[PDB]
Each structure stands twice: as structure tokens, then as C-alpha cells.
Amino acid sequence: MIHLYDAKSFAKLRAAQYAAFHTDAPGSWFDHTSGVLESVEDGTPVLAIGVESGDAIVFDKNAQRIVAYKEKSVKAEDGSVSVVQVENGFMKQGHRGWLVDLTGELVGCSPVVAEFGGHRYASGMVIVTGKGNSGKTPLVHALGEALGGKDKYATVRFGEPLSGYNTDFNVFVDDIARAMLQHRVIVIDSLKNVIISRGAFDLLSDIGAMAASRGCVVIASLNPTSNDDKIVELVKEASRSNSTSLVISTDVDGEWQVLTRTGEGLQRLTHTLQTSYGEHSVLTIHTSQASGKAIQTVIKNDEL
Amino acid sequence: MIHLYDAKSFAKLRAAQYAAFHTDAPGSWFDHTSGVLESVEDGTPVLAIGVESGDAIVFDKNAQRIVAYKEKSVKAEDGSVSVVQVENGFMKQGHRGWLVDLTGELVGCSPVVAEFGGHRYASGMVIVTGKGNSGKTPLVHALGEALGGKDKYATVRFGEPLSGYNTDFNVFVDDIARAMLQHRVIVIDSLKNVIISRGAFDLLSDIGAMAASRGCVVIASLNPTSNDDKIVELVKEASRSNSTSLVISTDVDGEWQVLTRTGEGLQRLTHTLQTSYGEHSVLTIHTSQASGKAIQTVIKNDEL
Amino acid sequence: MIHLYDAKSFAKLRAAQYAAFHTDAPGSWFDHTSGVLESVEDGTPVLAIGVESGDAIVFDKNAQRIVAYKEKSVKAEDGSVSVVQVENGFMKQGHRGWLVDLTGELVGCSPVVAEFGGHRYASGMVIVTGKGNSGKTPLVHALGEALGGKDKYATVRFGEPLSGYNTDFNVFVDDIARAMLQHRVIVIDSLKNVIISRGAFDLLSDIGAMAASRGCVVIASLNPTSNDDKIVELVKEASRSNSTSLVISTDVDGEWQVLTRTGEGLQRLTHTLQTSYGEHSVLTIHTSQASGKAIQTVIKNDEL
Amino acid sequence: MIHLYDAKSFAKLRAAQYAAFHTDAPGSWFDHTSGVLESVEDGTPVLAIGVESGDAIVFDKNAQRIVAYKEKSVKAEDGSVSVVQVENGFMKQGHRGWLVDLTGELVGCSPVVAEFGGHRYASGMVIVTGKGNSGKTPLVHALGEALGGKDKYATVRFGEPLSGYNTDFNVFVDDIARAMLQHRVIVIDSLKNVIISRGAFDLLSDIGAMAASRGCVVIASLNPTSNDDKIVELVKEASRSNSTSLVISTDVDGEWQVLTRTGEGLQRLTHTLQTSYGEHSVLTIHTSQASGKAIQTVIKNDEL
Amino acid sequence: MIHLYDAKSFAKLRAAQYAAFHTDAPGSWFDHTSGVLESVEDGTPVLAIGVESGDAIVFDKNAQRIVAYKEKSVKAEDGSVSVVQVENGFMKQGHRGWLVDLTGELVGCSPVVAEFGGHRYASGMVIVTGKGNSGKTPLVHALGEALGGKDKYATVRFGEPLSGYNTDFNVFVDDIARAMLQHRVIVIDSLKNVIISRGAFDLLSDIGAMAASRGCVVIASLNPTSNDDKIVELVKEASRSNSTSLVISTDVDGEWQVLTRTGEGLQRLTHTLQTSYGEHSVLTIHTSQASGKAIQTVIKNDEL
Amino acid sequence: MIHLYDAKSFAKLRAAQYAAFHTDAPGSWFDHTSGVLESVEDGTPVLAIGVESGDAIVFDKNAQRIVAYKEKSVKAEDGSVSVVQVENGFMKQGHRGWLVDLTGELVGCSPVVAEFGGHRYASGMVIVTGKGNSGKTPLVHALGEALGGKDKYATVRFGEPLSGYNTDFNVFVDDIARAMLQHRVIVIDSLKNVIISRGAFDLLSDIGAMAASRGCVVIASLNPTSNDDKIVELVKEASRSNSTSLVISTDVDGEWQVLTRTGEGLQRLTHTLQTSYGEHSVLTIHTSQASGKAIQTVIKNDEL
Numbered sequence A, B, C, D, E, F: 001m002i003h004l005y006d007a008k009s010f011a012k013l014r015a016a017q018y019a020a021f022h023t024d025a026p027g028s029w030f031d032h033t034s035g036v037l038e039s040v041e042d043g044t045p046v047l048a049i050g051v052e053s054g055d056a057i058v059f060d061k062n063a064q065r066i067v068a069y070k071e072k073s074v075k076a077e078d079g080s081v082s083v084v085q086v087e088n089g090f091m092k093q094g095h096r097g098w099l100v101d102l103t104g105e106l107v108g109c110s111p112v113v114a115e116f117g118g119h120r121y122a123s124g125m126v127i128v129t130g131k132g133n134s135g136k137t138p139l140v141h142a143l144g145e146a147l148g149g150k151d152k153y154a155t156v157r158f159g160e161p162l163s164g165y166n167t168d169f170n171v172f173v174d175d176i177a178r179a180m181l182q183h184r185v186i187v188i189d190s191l192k193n194v195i196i197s198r199g200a201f202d203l204l205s206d207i208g209a210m211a212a213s214r215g216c217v218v219i220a221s222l223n224p225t226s227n228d229d230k231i232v233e234l235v236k237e238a239s240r241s242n243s244t245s246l247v248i249s250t251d252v253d254g255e256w257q258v259l260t261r262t263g264e265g266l267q268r269l270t271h272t273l274q275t276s277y278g279e280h281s282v283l284t285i286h287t288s289q290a291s292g293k294a295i296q297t298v299i300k301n302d303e304l
């Protein structure tokens, strides 16, 4: 909805956003939203995501698709009215994204999803990319394991010519929706094929906000390697504007840079990661700050 | 509608437009239009805005959507007839923009919306952009608070991968419409995703006139950073032609230049802003003239 | 319709076209067509103009839309048949342009619309453009007033982020149709937003001929400034091929060049205008010749 | 239809084609086809031409549109079957072009349409173009008069911002169809606006063959001036491949080059024209050979 | 259908393909397929070809169009089922190409169509092209007569601005289909206009295989002359990949090079032709080897 | 479906993927999936593949199309539900790819398809390409025979101007579906014509995964030669991202490099092949390793 501010309430908002990343207990936001979702009336639509055509499918708190749901209006705090209607498996009225309020007045945050090796990581969408030899797939799985911590991470597989990989975009959004409804740490192996259908465009523009609202993190690999400035520029835009965090390889094999947006209007942070391979390509991230817009575009230059 | 002029009535018009910016009390046009809107019969359509598909949704004076409205024709002073009809939630007959006359013969103005730090600011649309390190988001919120003055400003959030952010264009135009119907100072955090669907194109072409007619100001951030001349040129076109005022960053961090169109056929004004950060990135605009077309393009060059 | 000629009838035709511009009384053609229009039976469709979709709306002699009109055929002198039919507010049968013959055998003329400062000006469409510091909006209004003479000029406002400006293309063509049905001098402030929908394309290709047939002049501003050779070339093409006359700014501020197509197969003329500003940006054109295609292309080069 | 040949019948065909241009009496082919058309059963569809949408309208021998005509099959010599059906004003079954056989076994000809100043001119389509100062409109009218000889020439006017010019493509094909059904020499003032809708594409690809089959000549002006290689290349292709003859200006003002295709597989001929202006821009062509493909492209280079 | 091979059956296949070009009697495959076609039940669909829209028209063995044919399924040797159904003149079920099997296990051949001047020529499609002065039209007709030998050749005419030329694509594919059903040597005068609608794209991709399967040869001229890399590259792609053989002009007027694909996986052959003109442009090919991929691209370079 | 992992389960997974390529018996996965497929209830849909329009056709375990199948839902281990429904020959509900689970928890593998000349080859899709003189068609057939071993390989022929080649995309995907349902080694001679319809796009993105899931190998030729960076880049992208393995010609005639993706997150391998021709162009691959991303891009450079 829309929110109104004066100097006092605005400074309070920035303090709360700053805290959502810097001082809240890691993963606390996810626990909170899990609670909100479980308290939802059974059968109530909670999430809508776009399919290939641009239409939207809808899920309930248990990640089950809602094929029929009669028009139901709810008036928001600001006066706006939300209408949700599902017919023949598709959204007749409503919008893409969360259909129930998980945030309230606390918007514009990058809720801390986990802490690892002395660094806080943000929920939302993390794009792992870059040119060079450092492998992306091995890195997204290591990050998944590390941010997972005590919890297992969920893996969504899409669009790679390997066994058992789904390549149908509509099955893909279903897997993603289920993952975000049920897990805090999610890995997507290959955003490459979404990079375009209406649904694919909606996905790139919606996923970061969906994840950040839930307090979960979606870690996705994206190979820039493609000298087609129509696509390479989309890679740079996806990484620049649709990602909450960016993990990009460097000049040194095994080394990566993490650039994190800490919240609305706040500074991006940066830190370096050292990694090494064990058996069967299992990668390990070794354990034992603020950057400006200029530095950011310098990094984006890497993908050309 | 159309208007007829001879030398005398044209000179009176330019004098009135000059005064709407330079001498009228700041914010007075907004108070004036609020009264016009409140005198509208209950249930009467007053504003129509384009949704993604190019269709339009319609609202009444209280910012409630009209789903059904039987054909009604009104003849204007110039002889033009306006027919409005709403069916199944969408405008069947009518046009985008204000459906009731808010201006009469007083057209082509940039009604002063507020005065801050010794400078007058125009209503209409203000695009905050430029390249460099100066952050745009902190600046749009500082301007919102500053021009808000004694009133709170409204914040419309769209298309950022952060918590609670709507990413659905149709929810976005609903928020924008309600905001212009009810508030004098509005901030849009991220015009980046509109920059294209029929709806998005309609929005860039319509918003400035809609706001200037209401006497409200809409402050939107737009990042030029994207070396794709297809998009970078659309940013410059939006900044050059669809904006009532332009706020652009300079070579000096923290410093900004404000270029203001004062009215139809009138000269653009320019002044500079110095700013600084407090805690949690809250920016403050420090407190304690005419330019030509050449200078303007010089400034536009900056976004390349 | 089609016309047949031999050497004798062709020479008489060129003499008549030459006279329509060089010696007829200024504005006499407009008075003649006004008589033709008023002698039309009531309810008879006289003008059709394309809306955004490419469909067309129809007006009677009093500039009122015709929503229903049963099929009616008329045979012309050349044997062609014109069938007009309007259903549900849109043309079902007919063509864009004048639905009643305003010209007969006298076609291919640029009927003199007015005389000012010792120069004859042609009716039809006049595009005011150019790069540089010289302001286009103040010039179109000064030309409107000057060619208006004893008559007031009509102003059609479209697509500028200023108060009361319509930004809906369909309201725009309704405004234009009414202006041409009722006034000899018309100003359009901003052809910029038409420069593309089917309707916008129809408008650029139809307006000059509609106005020249009527004997009225449409003075429209168009800013070339936009380094996108897709658009900048559309500005050059419209100025080259869709304009009866072109008014373009020069190297010297305040100075403009007027290039006039005097008639079918006849030579283009050229003259210069000096101007200055008074209070509130009111511009005054100071008072007290054949060119070749080469010269024309040189002038067009200016818009790059 | 398809035709079968052995060496003997092929040499006979080339002899007959060669004769159709070089030795037949000028204009004899047109007289012959006029006879064939007048002998046609009344109400029988004889010509179909594409409108803007790509649909086709149909005319009878008297240039009157056929709105309804029930399915009717005719078996051709080669075994192919022609079906013609018109419903609600449009062609339901059939093809664009002549719906009755005007040629027989004599195909691939450029029937001599007239002789003037010691030169034979071909029927079909003549495109008058080129860069430089020599005016095209004055030249197409002089050629029209000269090839007309004892007969008047017909003028189709389309897409110029001058009085009485039709700008509706569907009215334009009707005028063209009527002209070809009833006159031997036709002038089209401005192919510029057709240069794209389905109908416009059909027109460029159909007109030359339609005219050559009828034995009439269609003289059309086409200004290349437009530095948009998307359009300029279409001008060159239209002139190279859709024209039976080409008349292009040269380095010397008033001088033109005529390149004529004399028939299927035959050599293109070339000759020069000297011209001068009299009063009111009436141009006169003064009165008192084989070229290779290379020379042809040299000339095409001129339009860049 | 699909075919299964081991080393032995594959070696037999290559031996049979080698013989279909090098040792079978010239024209024998065409005689063979004529018998297969004549053994087809009356009224049975045997060939389907795409019309402009992408739909397909269907013919029986006597080259008569089938307007209605009830669903009929046939199971092939490999297990694939072919279902054919024609409704209202268009294929409702089926595929483009031959609807009856003309080849069995003998696939991937370039069946020798004729022998002339000591050289064997392949059936399938032959593109005659190149830059320079050597005329293509005279050459396609000389090859037609020469390969025709004791039989007349069929000429399909399309898209030239000359008398009696069809310019309607749908009439064109009807002529082509009837020609391949009834004649061994076919000349197409002007593939220039197909070079794009779904139908045109289907034609370039289908014609070569259709002809090579029938054992007939289709000789088509294609002018590369058009400096529009969009089109010039399509010409080279057509010459490189959609042609069974290529006949291209050289630096020496009258001289041509013939590049022949002899079969699936086999080497391309090359030989040279000397030619001369007699009366009325009738060309005669004078009478009295392997190349690599490199040489081939060298030749393709010529068309730029 | 989606899968959950912790450090322990992830390491077990990588060990299993590593083994599926490096140590499992060659061709064992194909035998396993053949068993899964044969144990499927009769009439059950097992594979869906997209046709030209983007719609999909469905096959049962015996490679016979299913034209009608009433809605039927199945719940997977992860909670996702698969609903399959076929109506009028097309999939009404379901997804492209395998409709029955052939993999379970073992996904992301490149199951070894065969061993030849001391090298293991992966199932999935293999693209044979490169510029130069080395022939692709003779190589795909030699690879087919060699990987076939004791089994015959299946050949799918598409889009070449040779006898018996199908050129209809819908017959093509039917051929491919049947080949993968019944054979371990499949050759596709000419992916060139798919390189675009929705179906063609679906095919490039689906085939590798379909084949790898089955344990069969699809060996497809693709000629890069075409200087149209729109297409040449599509060849590089397909070879880079849609291929399980790549076989590319080198500087030395007869020599090829094989780059193999061994599994999800695992290293690519590389080895060289020497070849020679026997009679009738039958090629023989002579008998008697990890690379980095840099090396891969270097090889891709070759196709420019």
C-alpha cells in the first residue's frame, strides 16, 4: 500500500530497516513470516506467480494450487482494496506476489537471512555470476549449504541439458513458489534459460521482492558468457536492478566478491570470499566494507 | 478542450501562468483542486489511469475504484462532448487523465507546490536522476519531506527487490491514482521498472500533466546507469520531455542541480542543492537563475 | 477523384494552382469552404479522422460526432463511389479525410491563408522545429496571432507535463477535427507525442491535406532534440514530406527560416523572420526567394 | 498459368516478346486488351487489388466494385482452375491481379505504350526518382502528356499535404484500379507514402505486372531523399525490381536518364532526356542504347 | 520416417546414394516416382504445399486440388502414423511435402535428372545467381531446355513487372505444385519476390527436398544485387543450404560455375559452363571436379 | 521436483553424479529407464514434446500418440502435483518432457552412454559443428555407428534439399520422440533448420535434458557458416548451453575436439579424434583431459 511520512516517522523507518539487516537475529524474519502464513485461513490464496503466458497461478499456505476461489475483497489500511478471484486454475482478479501482508509498515528491508564466516547475508535474490574460470554451480551449492546452517537448503533445477532437469517454465514457477513457501534457503540452478516470455520477465522483476518479503534467500547462477549485448545487457540489468545481493567472480581463481544491498536507501556492503574444491567438485567457502555507486558499475563492467 | 486567443487574451494567459508559479501562494492550486473534486457528485468518475494492457481503471473523488457506471455525456464550453462509461471494472468510454475539468482557462501552468530554502518548486512530475555517486533514493525522500513541509508526504513503492515492495504494474497505477487524489507531495520509489507495456508508456506520457493539473508533485527516481542506448535514450526523453522539473546529480558528491519548467512557453529556472547524510542514511538538504535550451542539453549529456 | 489532362487543361490547372497561392485574396479559400460546409444537409458526415486504434470517428458540419448513420452512397464526377456508414460511434464505411468534396477540379493547391509582414503564408500544415536556443512554443503562438489577424486562433494542447494538458490521443484528434471545422488558424502545442500508433501515423499523413483542402493552417511545434535516428529521422521525414510549410530555427537566436511549398509541382519559397520577447515570454515577429531541393536538404541537416 | 517450351517454341516466344516492344504499333496492346475487357460478360469480376489490410477488392469491366459474386470456377489451358468469389465487398476466393486472361501465350512482354521524340516507351510501371535538384512532379506530368499523345492522361493523387489530395490507401487503390481499367497513360503523384501495410507491399509488387498486362503505363514519382537505409533501400529495390522502366535524374539540372526493360530476358535500353520549364512550372521534354547489369547498379548508387 | 543402421546397412546406403547420382540412368528416378504416384488410389492426397498464411493446400496425383478429404490414418514401416484430413480447401491434418512415400529406404540422394554436354545434373533445386553482367534469366531458360533434352520444360512465372506475370504467392505455389507433379524439368522465373511470409519461408525450406524426392529439377533465378545484409544473407543462406545445386556467374561474362551436391554426406562437384547469345537473347550453353567446403564459401563470398 | 540437501546428502549426490559418468557400466542407465518405461500402465502418457505452434503432442511407452486422455493427477514425493490431460490430439494439461519420473533423486547426471576408442561418451545432446573443411554429416554417422556398438543407431532426417527428407517441423518432433522412446543412439541430420518458432525454441531447450534423463544420446549436426551474428550467436549459445557434449572441427582436416559435460557442477573433459574416409565417403574414427571455462570460450570463438 502507500505509506505517509514526516521527518520523525521517516527516521524511525530507516532505523528499523537498518536494524532488520544489521542487528535482528539472523533468520528471525523468516520465522515471523512462517507464523503469519500458518495462521492464514485454510484455502486462502497466499501467493500468485506468473506462468509463461503472463497469466498467474495461485497457491495456498501449503503450496497447493488453488484452482477455484470466489471473488473476495479486503480493504487495506491505506484505503486500497485487494480483490482475489481464481477460476479454472488461474487468477481472475488479484496481483502477482504475496496475497497476504507479511510486512506491515516494515517495508524496504533486506532481512538478514543468515550469518556465516563473520558476515551477515541478506534474504531476497542473490545472483551468482561473472566471467572467468571460477565455477558458478559449485558456488551456489556451497552458499546454499552455508546459509542453510542447521537447515537443509532446497534446490530448484531448471534448463540444463542434464538428467532429470525440468525445462518447462510453468513447472519451474511451481517449484519456486513451493520452495519459497516452505524453505529459508533456496538454490536455483540456472536462471540462464529464463534470460523472453511474459512470465520470464515477470519472474526476474518479482522474485527479489517475493523472497525479501518472506525473509528467504534465492541463490541463482547466471552465466554472462554470451557476446550478444541484447542478452549480456539483460544479465547486467538483472544483476544490477533485480538482485538484492550479487556474488561475482574475480581475477583470482576461487575468489569471489559479495555486494549486498542492506535496505531501502542504505549503503551496499562488500566483502571477499576464498574457496577451494574437495572431492567430486564439492566446494568449500573458507571462513577465517561500504562501497559507492561508482565501484558498483566497475564490477558490472566485468561481465563484458 | 481547445481555447481561442487574440493578442490581449493571450497576454492575460501568460500573465496568469507566470503568477501560478511565481506569486500564487505555495500549494494553493492543490487546495483549489481539492475543492473542485469535493464538489463532484457522489459516484462520479474523476480520474482514469492506464493499466498494463492499455485499458484504464477509473476512480471517484474518494479514490475508490468504479466498477460500473452507465454512459453519461457532458458537453464542455468549447463544444466538445465527454462521454464516460465504466463496465466490469474498466473504462468502456472516456479518456485517460482527469475526467472532470480542474483547470478551466488556466492551462499550461506549473502551479507552485511548495517553497523550501528560499526556492519555489513546481507541482507536476520531478525526475531525480544522473550518474555518479550521489544516491537518488535518499534524495527523493528528503525532497518529499521538504516540500511536504507541514504535511506528510505519500510514498508509492514499486519494483525493487526489497521487502514489501509491490512489483505488479496494475497495483502500481492504483497506488499512484489514490496518491494524487489525496496528497500534495508524492514520492515514487522506482520508476526504473516502468522504463515497455502500453500501460507503462501511457504512464510516462500522462503522469506529469495529471499532477500539474491537480497541483500535486510526484518525485520519482530514475537510474540512467544502463549502457543500452535504447533505454538510456528513453531515460533522457523522459527527463527532457515528460518531466515538469529535473533534479540531477553533479561531479561533486552531495550536490544537485534543479531545472524547473515554470510554465507553457516560459523560461526554465536552475538552482543548486547541497546535501548531507545523518544517521541511517537520512539525507538533509541544506538551506542557507534562468537557463537556455543549450544548457539543458548539456545537462542531459550527463546521462551517457 | 482522378482527373484527366492534355497540354491545354494541364496548363490551366497550373495557372490556377499558382494563383491560389500567389494572387487570390488571403484567406478567401477558407471562406469558400465554410460556405460549402454550411450548405451541407444536416446530419451529413463531413469529416473522418483516425483514432489511436486506426479506426475513425466522424463529424458533421457543426463539429459534433455522428454515432449512427445508415449506409449512403454518392457517385462522383469521375465515376468513383463514396459510401459512408457510421455505427456505434465508428466509421463502418468511408475514408479518412473530408467526406464532402471541398475542392472539385481545383486540387494540388496551397491556398494562401494569410499575409503578414509582407509575406503570404500557405494553409495546410506548418511544422515549427529546429535545434538550438530559439523557443518553439513562443513562436507558434506568435505565428498563430499574426496569421489570425482580425480572427482569434484556436489552440489544441497535447502531451506536455503542464496543467490541463490532455495526453490522450483520441481526445486530441477530436480537438483537431473541431478546430479545423471551425477556425482558419490553429496552433498545436506538441506534435512531439505523436512522433507509433496506427492513428498517429494516420494523423501525420492526413493533416496537411485536410487543412490545405479546408484552407486553414495548422501550426505545430516539434522538438528534434533526441539522438535516436529512429525518431530524429521521423522528424525530418515529417518536416520534409508531411508539411506544407516548414519554420526552422537558425544559428542566430531569435531568427527563423520559413520554407513554403506553394503548390503541386511548384517551387518552394523561403524568407527569414526576426523576433524578440516582451513581458511573460510573449514573442513578437518583426515586420519591416525561390529555393532548390539542395537548399531544402541542407536545412533538414540542421535537425541532427 | 505454366507454359511448356522446347528450343523451337522458346525462340518463337522471344521473337514475339522482342516484337511486342520493338515493332508492334505503339499502344496496340492497350487497344487489344480494351477489346478483351469490353467483351466480358457484364458483372464478371475482371480485376482484384489489395486494400490496406491485405484483403482484396474487386472490379468489373466498368470499374465498378463488385460486392457480391457467387463462387465460379474456370479451368485454364494448363489444367489449373481459377475460382472467384466475392462476399460483403471483398474477395473470398481468387487472386490479386487480372481475373480474366488478357495475354494468353504472350507473356513476359513490355508492350510498347507510345513513341515520342524518336523513342519507344514501355507500358508497365515507370518510377521517376533520383537525388538532386531536377523536379520529379513536373517530369511525371510532362511524360504523362507526351506519352498520352492524342489522348489525355489520368492523374491519381495520393499522400501529399496539398488541397484535395486523398491520403486514405483504400481510396487510392480504387482510383488506381479505375485508372488502369480506363486509360492508357496514368500518373501517380506520390508513391512516397506507400513506401509498410500488407496492401502497400502488395501494391509495389503487383502494379508493374498489372499495367504491363493491360498495355498501359503508370508513371510514379518517388523521392529517395531520406537517409534511412531501411527506406532508401526499399526505394532502390522498388526501382530495381518492381519497375518496368526507370527515369532518374542526373548531375546536370534538367537532364534525365531513361532505363527501359524491353521484355523477359531481354536487354535494358537507355537514352537521355533534356527538359526545360515554361510558365507556372509546366515542364517540356525536348525532342530533337543497350546497357549492362553493371551500368544499372551504377545508376542505383545515385540514390544514396 | 526414421531409419536404423549398423556399419553394413550404412555402407549399402552410401553405395546406393552414390549410384543414384553417378550411375543410374539420367531421369530414371523421375520415371520411377511417376509410377508410384500413378498407383495411388484415386482422390488420395499426394502433395501438400504452404500458402502465404502458412496453411497448406493439397493435390491429388493428377494435380487437382482436394477441397475435402475425411480423416485417414496410415501407419508407416517405422511405426509413425500419417493422418491426412482436408477441410474447406485446406489441410486440417497432415504435413507439408509428399503425402505418399516416394523414396522408401532410398533417401539422402540427389537423383540424376539429366546429362548434358558430358556432365550429370542433379534433380532437386538449382539456384542461378551471382553478381556481374552475365544475365540469369537467359541462363535458366537455356538450362531448362538443355536438361529437358527430349522433353519440354515447364516455366513458372512469378513477380516480375512484365505482361501476364502472376504476382500472387498463392497462385504461385499452386503452379509449382502442379509443375512438380507433372514435369521433370521446371524453371521458376523469379524467386526474387519470395525472398517474408510463413508461406515464403516454408517454400525455401521445402522445395529442394520436394523436387529431389520426385526426381525433378527446379531451376530458379535469384539476384543477390541488393546491399541489404538482411536480404543478401538470406540469398547466401538459400544458395548455401536450401539448394541442391548452385550455378553462379564469374568474372568472365558468359562463364558460369556449377556446384553440385551429389548426395547425403557426399562430396560436391564443380564444373564450368561457357555460353553465348543468339538472336533475341536466346542463350546457348556450349558443349565440347570435387571441391571442399572452403572453396564453397569462397564462391558464396561473390554475392556481397 | 525440488530436492533438499545438507552437507552430507549433497556430498553423496555429487559422488553419485560423478559415478553415473565415470564408473557406471556404459549404457546401463538406458537399460534402467527402458525398464521403468515398460512397467508403465498401458495407455499412460510418458512423453510430451512441443510442436511448431508451441502446443505439445503426447506419446505412450510404445511411441504411439495419445489423442485423448482424461485428466489424471499424481502427487510427487516433494509435494508437487502433475496433472496430465490430452484432448483432440494435444496436451491440455501437463508439461513438456518426461511425464513419468525416470530419475527420482538421481538428477544432474550425464549418464555414460557408451565407451569407444578408450573414451567414455555422455548421453544427452551432442552438437557436431565447427567451420572449416571437415564434414559434419560423415562424422555424425560415424559417431552414431561407433556409440551404437552392438546396436543399430536411429537416423532422424530433417531440412536438407535431398530425396526423402522431411522438412515439416511437426513430423520432425514426432520422429525425435519415437527415436528417444526406442533407441539409445540417435543421429539428427540437420538441426540447421530449427536454428524461430515456439516449438523450435522449446526443442533446443528441452532435448538435451530429455535425452540425458533417458540415457540415450542425440548426435546432431549444425553448420555455423552464416555470417549473421543473430544466427551465428544462436549456434554458439546452443553449443554452449543446450548441449551436453560438443564435437567441433579444428585447424587440421579430419581432426575433431570433443568437450564433454560430465555432470552437474562437475568439470568438462576434452579429447581429440582423428578420422579418415573410405569408399563412398564412409568415415572411420581412429582408435588407438579436464578443461576450464576459458578453454571452452576459446573453442566457441572458432564459430565466427
Ligand SMILES: Nc1ncnc2c1ncn2[C@@H]1O[C@H](COP(=O)(O)OP(=O)(O)O)[C@@H](O)[C@H]1O
Residues within 6 Å of the ligand: A133, A134, A135, A136, A137, A138, A221, A223, A277, A280, A281, F264, F265, F266, F267, F268, F291, F292, F293
Ligand atoms: N575440481 C574442480 N577444480 C577446478 N574447477 C572445477 C572443479 N570442479 C568443478 N569445477 C568448475 O565448476 C564449474 C562447473 O559447473 P558448471 O555449471 O558446469 O559451470 P559454470 O557454473 O562455470 O557455468 C565449471 O566452471 C568447472 O570447470
Ligand SMILES: Nc1ncnc2c1ncn2[C@@H]1O[C@H](COP(=O)(O)OP(=O)(O)O)[C@@H](O)[C@H]1O
Residues within 6 Å of the ligand: A261, A264, A265, A266, A267, A268, A291, A292, A293, B133, B134, B135, B136, B137, B138, B221, B223, B277, B280, B281
Ligand atoms: N551514509 C551514506 N553515505 C554516502 N552514501 C550513502 C549513504 N547512505 C546511502 N548512500 C547512497 O544512497 C543510495 C542508496 O539508495 P539506492 O536506491 O540503493 O541507490 P540509488 O538511489 O543511488 O540508485 C546509494 O547510492 C548509496 O550508496
Ligand SMILES: Nc1ncnc2c1ncn2[C@@H]1O[C@H](COP(=O)(O)OP(=O)(O)O)[C@@H](O)[C@H]1O
Residues within 6 Å of the ligand: B264, B265, B266, B267, B268, B291, B292, B293, C133, C134, C135, C136, C137, C138, C221, C223, C277, C280, C281
Ligand atoms: N524571455 C525569454 N527570453 C529568451 N528565451 C525565452 C524567453 N521566454 C521563453 N524563452 C524560451 O522559449 C521556450 C519555451 O517554450 P518551451 O516549450 O518550453 O521550449 P521549446 O519550444 O524551445 O521546446 C524555451 O526554449 C525558453 O527558453
Ligand SMILES: Nc1ncnc2c1ncn2[C@@H]1O[C@H](COP(=O)(O)OP(=O)(O)O)[C@@H](O)[C@H]1O
Residues within 6 Å of the ligand: C264, C265, C266, C267, C268, C291, C292, C293, D133, D134, D135, D136, D137, D138, D221, D223, D277, D280, D281
Ligand atoms: N520554374 C522552375 N524552375 C526550376 N525548378 C522548378 C521550377 N518549377 C518547379 N521546379 C522544381 O520542381 C519540383 C516541384 O515538385 P515537388 O513535388 O514539389 O518536388 P519534387 O518532385 O522534386 O519532389 C521541385 O524540385 C521544384 O524546385
Ligand SMILES: Nc1ncnc2c1ncn2[C@@H]1O[C@H](COP(=O)(O)OP(=O)(O)O)[C@@H](O)[C@H]1O
Residues within 6 Å of the ligand: D261, D264, D265, D266, D267, D268, D291, D292, D293, E133, E134, E135, E136, E137, E138, E221, E223, E277, E280, E281
Ligand atoms: N544479347 C545479349 N547480350 C548480352 N547480354 C544480354 C543479351 N540479352 C540479354 N542479356 C542479359 O540477360 C539479362 C536479362 O534478363 P533479366 O531478367 O532482365 O536480368 P537478370 O537475369 O541479369 O536479372 C540481363 O542481365 C541482360 O543484360
Ligand SMILES: Nc1ncnc2c1ncn2[C@@H]1O[C@H](COP(=O)(O)OP(=O)(O)O)[C@@H](O)[C@H]1O
Residues within 6 Å of the ligand: E264, E265, E266, E267, E268, E291, E292, E293, F133, F134, F135, F136, F137, F138, F221, F223, F277, F280, F281
Ligand atoms: N571422400 C571425401 N574426402 C574428403 N571429404 C569428403 C569426402 N566425402 C565427403 N566429404 C565431405 O563431407 C561433407 C559432406 O556432408 P555435407 O552435409 O554435405 O557437408 P557438411 O557436413 O560439412 O556441412 C562435405 O563437407 C564433404 O566435402
